[PDB]
Design a protein around this ligand. Structure first.
Ligand SMILES: NCCC[C@H](N)CC(=O)NCCC[C@H](N)CC(=O)NCCC[C@H](N)CC(=O)N[C@@H]1[C@H](O)[C@@H](OC(N)=O)[C@@H](CO)O[C@H]1NC1=N[C@@H]2C(=O)NC[C@@H](O)[C@H]2N1
Lengths: 117, 150
RNA sequence: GUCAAGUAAUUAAGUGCAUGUGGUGGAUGCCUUGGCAGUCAGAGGCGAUGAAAGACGUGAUAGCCUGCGAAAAGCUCCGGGGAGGCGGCAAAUAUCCUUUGAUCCGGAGAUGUCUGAAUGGGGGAACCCACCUACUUUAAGGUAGGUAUUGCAACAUGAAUACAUAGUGUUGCAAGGCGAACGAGGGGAAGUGAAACAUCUCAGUACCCUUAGGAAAAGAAAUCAAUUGAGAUUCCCUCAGUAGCGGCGAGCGAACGGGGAUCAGCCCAUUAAGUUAUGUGUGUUUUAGUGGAACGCUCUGGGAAGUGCGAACGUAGAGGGUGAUAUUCCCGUACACGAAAGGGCACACAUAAUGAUGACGAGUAGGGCGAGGCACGUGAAACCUUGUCUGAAUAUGGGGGGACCAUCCUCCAAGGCUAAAUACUCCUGACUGACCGAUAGUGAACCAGUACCGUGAGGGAAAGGCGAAAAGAACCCCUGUGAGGGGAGUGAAAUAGAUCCUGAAACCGCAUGCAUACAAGCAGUGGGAGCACCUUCGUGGUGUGACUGCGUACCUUUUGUAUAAUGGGUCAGCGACUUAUAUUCAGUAGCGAGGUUAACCGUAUAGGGGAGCCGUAGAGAAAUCGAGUCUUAAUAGGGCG
RNA sequence: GAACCCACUGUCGUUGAAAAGCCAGGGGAUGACUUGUGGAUAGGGGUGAAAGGCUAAUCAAGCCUGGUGAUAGCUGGUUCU
RNA sequence: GCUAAAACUAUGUGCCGAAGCUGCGGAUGUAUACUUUGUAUACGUGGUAGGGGAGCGUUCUGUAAGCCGAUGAAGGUGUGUUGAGAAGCAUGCUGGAGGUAUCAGAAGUGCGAAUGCUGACGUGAGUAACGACAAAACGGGUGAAAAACCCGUUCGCCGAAAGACCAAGGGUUCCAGUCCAACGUUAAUCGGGGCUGGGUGAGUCGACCCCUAAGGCGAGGCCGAAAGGCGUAGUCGAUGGGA
RNA sequence: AUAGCACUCUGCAAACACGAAAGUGGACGUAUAGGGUGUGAUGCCUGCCCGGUGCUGGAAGGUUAAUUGAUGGGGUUAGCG
RNA sequence: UAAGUUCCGACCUGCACGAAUGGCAUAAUGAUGGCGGCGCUGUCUCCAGCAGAGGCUCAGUGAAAUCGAAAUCGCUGUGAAGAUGCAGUGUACCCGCGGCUAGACGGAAAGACCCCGUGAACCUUUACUGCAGCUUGACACUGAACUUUGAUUGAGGUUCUAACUCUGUCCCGUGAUCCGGGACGAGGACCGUGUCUGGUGGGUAGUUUGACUGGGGCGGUCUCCUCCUAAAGAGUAA
RNA sequence: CCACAAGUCGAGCAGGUACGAAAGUAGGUCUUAGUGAUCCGGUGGUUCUGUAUGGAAGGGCCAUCGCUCAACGGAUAAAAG
RNA sequence: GGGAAGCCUACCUCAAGAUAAGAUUUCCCUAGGACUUUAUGUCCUCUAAAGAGCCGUUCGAGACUAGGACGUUGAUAGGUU
């Protein structure tokens, strides 16, 4: 029962090379190089699925800081005021409002100042 | 493998990977790493286990109605068509026939029929009891099988 | 309108990615006039009447292969067969042959150059040189035969030396050489293991030498056993990894008894069984061959054996081929017949020979010394063989029963022959494979032990596939009457067009879209604008990716590697925990205080075969006891149960 | 001091024209001389005006084929989820 | 970059900050109850050497005279889709004859590394080099094409060899016609290249022959487990003697 | 390496070397010859040591091999008990 | 010599000259070692010009070792401890050609030095254990006569021929320096060979020749008892 | 106490004994070092075994002897550079 | 306030790829249709300037390049005088 490896080996190599599409030079042509590139891409993606949440929260915080400073507060004081006022709107929605609706963000800042008073 | 007696090149200094024979199993055209030899594939079967399996097979055939008992089964001439007509009227066109003794005319008539075989009562085997669609057994053969107790 | 400040668009020498279309290369799939391993039945040799292996020649055209030998792809006779043929690569042409019987197949004859045991002498194999006799020619020849050595026999001849002998010659007979494995005999290692090494192991193995047969060797008790029993030799299962041997290490390793296979005894001087030749008779088998059943329509298609419908044969539904998958198209298959002539085997008779220079076993048994073989390494070492020195009794006698003695039991050495069961495969025929399918399987599917390498012994490759059929591309055009291509034509298909099925990857082009010439690093990843095409018009698809956070390959080896520590230029194909036996444990199945057969027989996975093995009792070194036993004066105590 | 036989110095060459050379100089050159042809000595052996030199570009034990798939407490490698 | 700090000491309010904790969705292991389950609760799920458990694919055997297939199999190449994964399924193009469910059974069953083996092809790079520094120039001819071939006129080099012979060794390379793919370190009309046809004439040259050296073999013979060693009579053996 | 020097062995079937043996070289030679060892033209020369190892010649006391086999001690049993 | 670790001559506390493993000299000789001088010069101060052959450009042919993949800068620091690739920072538009060798711990050869493996080979010897060779005695081949002497036996001496030796002469096979047979001559129970046995035996052969260890070697150590190190149970290393 | 092989302490029972009037004490010495496995053999005993049987040889069991095996868990009977 | 061969200038050469790409003088180009993607928009037709280069003769410039001079309205090179 002699077994020839050609068909299955070719399928596996072709699948790896297909996942390596778009890479530079030997990384999209040569199996030994392409296989390392795919694994490292997977490792990077696993790490960056965690990094993405941090980066987007940092962006929301920066935009909220800009809005609060336009309304006469700092970010930390505005967050403290909202907590004391019991408002539980999260930073993603707060930054969306800060970017797209200035009047509503002004109202939120006024509520935060009123609670801080 | 033919040849391969001498060391292909010296151990050190050439820059090659070290080699001891051109018939190494690593090399193309070399020996097979674990060369096969003729093997015996027979297994031991306990006498009681074989008899029990045969009894189970016969009982299951009776339960599934694939065993057909007939008082007598014989043909008057070594003609295929006569046996074919007999099997057709028995509604056993694909069958293993079991007889107390195999008549020469029956053997000759059954030789060329596909899906039909004829055997003696002392020559049944578990594979043939299962492979054929039906088993047509004469009463004398059934009693001999009973005496043999499966 | 001018100036100023600010800020878009616009380039690609080249490059990246994606897609399309190619080139190179020959993977993959499918295939096979080639290999691998067996079963059954035969056969087991060829050679001085010149072998194995070769050289040279032989054809209308003749290079190689095959055949053959100056009578040269062949001659004669007999038999078979009945429409074609002049061997293959390898077409084509010419001469031809053939129903007055060709080619072809089988049997028997004829011819059969040179070398090679080579044998008239010599020699660097395929060459050089001869002698004698008979016949024939007239010129410097031709035809036929003889001329090696050794051994044996007969005859003749014949020294020192008188008889003789040695020696010499002639005639007749025989031998030599080659080739697979198995047999018998003469010599005989080391690597390795002992975790070193010398005893020991490896192992009487590898190798060298001599020499048979279809088998060989052995064989009919101076043998075992130990209720006085068995009854020649050989092979298998068990006894049993037991008893023993062993720097008591590593290891080596029986026998008795039991179960099977096969069975057989006969002789020593008027001389047996048996064996071998020859001749005759009978039987069987083998080497050519003959006949041999039964299918149509329809659809798809280049082509039907495939679809649909309905028939026929089957003692034939094995297999192969035919334009795709056929019981009924072809060759065959079951079955029924068949031999001028020759060969093999069996049986019977007849004649030779042989058995058979041998008539009961003396330089023998036994002993001292040194070695070898026995599972047994000097050991308490019996028994067998003998290099050396010795040396009986001879049936009122002698050998053995593992130091030795006595008693008992058993056998008769110093003379022979003998089938079967057993071992093997260079070969012949038939059949088979959970064996390979061109990097596999033989080194070799193909002009392979070739090409090539070496002074030589020796080593040793690569290389399969057009198409069903050559129908292998007439003719036109470019070009050098080249190569190559574009048309035309053939074909189902020509991107099947000649190193031609399929046509992967590395690697190399061309075309289109986007990005890219102020910006520093494992080349990605998470975000993300713009552009091009598509569109179900979007919260959509495809390609690209300005700008931006993070981010020093993989394997191995290490306390620890981005490491400037190892390995990899890349792709494709191959490449490493197997097989047999024994043993222990787990799972599962049968049977259960029982379970199970081995060899072997067996128209054979069945059914027989109970010898043997494991379990059912332990204690003790052992004799012995035994649910106990050992220790001890102890019934105490204690150890194993 | 030419031929012939050697090989003391230097540059070049070192993937060479060459697996030991070219060029410029150098030594012997009637002798213990150089050389052709054909022979003898064979591996623990041969041969050596002696360097462990030479014995077919191989020498503190030639080459080939066998024991043989020697052994390696060492290094490397060991394939899908 | 920072000086009544963005430094140091003390005190206080907030906030940022991890794969820790919480929220939402999903998978899996163990236990406890449901007195079948595949439903709830609780507690777990980083891992080298290792140990245990469960699977995917590949070749072959039976199931299979079955099922799929020229209305197009395997293989190749794209696209879409499914699962936790090894992987599966469908389909466009190419291809042109095989493939094979399910459940069992056997293994030449999975490659990136071993300075692994075989073939193909890259980088270096159109880079080094084109083999004695005796040396070339022009006119005409042929030819598709002339620095290299032919003819002619000049120039230069060797001349104790770079000329003329023999032996050894090689084996057709010799001569003529014809061709230029490969070979020739460039081109080539040329060639020691391909193809076709010719060519070697002996009493006196050489070999053969007669003769012997070193040495080889060796009837008998002597010696040795065998193979074999040596050697007498002889017989070969030129590098020497013989018209 | 060498001419020269010295020591030593060898009476011929020489010592010595090759070989398993037969046989062969030494040598168709014969101590003015042949082998081994050291020194190294020539000039002048070459001192002391025999305790050690070796070699040569003595000696017949001690020790010691095979071989030979005197004695002593056991095993077995006719018999006596 | 301006300046002399070399050279020449001399001195003698010669680490550690010395007489055939020769001592001290010695004419001639040596591609032999050391030192000095004349002449001469690109050896040099210090290089310049020129000739030929490459280099460079064009046309034709067309290699090599290497190579995980590359979008392949400097500095300071960090870090498997000497960074193109990490951190901070500086500089820098894209691509050739002629040169160059500071780095890529550049290429080349699984370091030859060092250590390790219960590895190898060859050589040496008063390492161990065998064997060849040489040698001793006993028995055998091996016999006959006289004699003398030692503590029944042993030993010795002198003759002889008939076993045996002759690489001595003659004859024959025989055309023959082998061999065989015959006849002599000289030897002779010696020599020599077989079995056993003591001695000798690097001629030859197989092997052995420890470990710990701030590398290895040298030195020290290797088993047992007591105290401390030993951190108030036991145990605990150099 | 301890990987194993080993090592250490021990009340109490039986027999025989010594010293004490007796209750009693004594299985070496105030304790902890003064040591060597296995194999192979020697010696004294023994109601074991005994290759046909009776014996015997040999073996077993109990007691005891022979290692500076000191590289002291000791690779060989036997080894330097 | 003074105060050094030291620092910045000053002297020589290079220098706007100084992407912050600077400044000054002078010179050149001013035409019509169609359409939809109404825009430095896409196809037509007509125009080809100032200059730069190819090529040639060359150099006190040069590996190739680059740089300088000249090309008949001419002394750029060779020749001639
Ligand atoms: N629009 C464009 C048009 C352009 C215009 N036209 C001009 C143009 O430009 N034209 C180009 C021309 C193309 C090309 N140049 C022509 C060419 O090449 N001819 C080659 C001619 C010679 C050829 N070498 C011969 C050859 O090889 N024989 C083979 C050979 O012996 C052998 O094969 C192997 N294995 O070795 C054998 C295998 O058994 O088979 C043989 N052969 C067989 N055949 C047979 C068959 O089929 N059955 C039966 C049996 O007879 C078979 N054997």
């Amino acid at each position: 029962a002699r077994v020839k490896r050609g068909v299955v080996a070719h399928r596996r190599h072709k699948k790896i090379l297909a996942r390596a599409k778009g890479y530079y030079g030997a990384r999209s042509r040569v199996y030994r190089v392409a296989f390392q590139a795919v694994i490292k891409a997977g490792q990077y993606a696993y790490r960056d699925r965690r990094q993405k949440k941090r980066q987007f929260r940092a962006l929301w915080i920066a935009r909220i800081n800009a809005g609060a400073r336009q309304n006469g507060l700092s970010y930390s004081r505005m967050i403290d005021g909202l907590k004391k006022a019991q408002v539980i709107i999260d930073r993603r929605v707060l930054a969306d409002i800060a970017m797209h609706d200035a009047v509503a963000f002004a109202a939120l800042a006024e509520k935060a100042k009123g609670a801080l008073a | 493998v033919s040849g391969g007696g001498k060391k292909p090149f010296r151990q050190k200094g050439t820059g090659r990977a070290r080699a001891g024979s051109i018939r190494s199993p690593i090399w193309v055209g070399g020996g097979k790493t674990f060369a096969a030899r003729p093997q015996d594939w027979s297994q031991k079967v306990n006498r009681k286990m074989y008899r029990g399996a045969m009894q189970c097979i016969l009982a299951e055939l009776v339960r599934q109605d694939r065993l057909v008992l007939v008082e007598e089964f014989a043909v008057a001439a070594p003609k295929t068509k006569e046996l074919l007509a007999k099997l057709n009227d028995l509604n056993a066109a694909r069958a293993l026939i079991v007889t107390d003794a195999v008549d020469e005319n029956l053997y000759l008539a059954a030789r060329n029929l596909p899906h039909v075989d004829v055997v003696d009562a002392t020559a049944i085997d578990p594979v043939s009891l299962i492979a054929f669609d039906k088993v047509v057994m004469s009463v004398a053969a059934a009693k001999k099988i009973e005496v043999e107790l499966g």
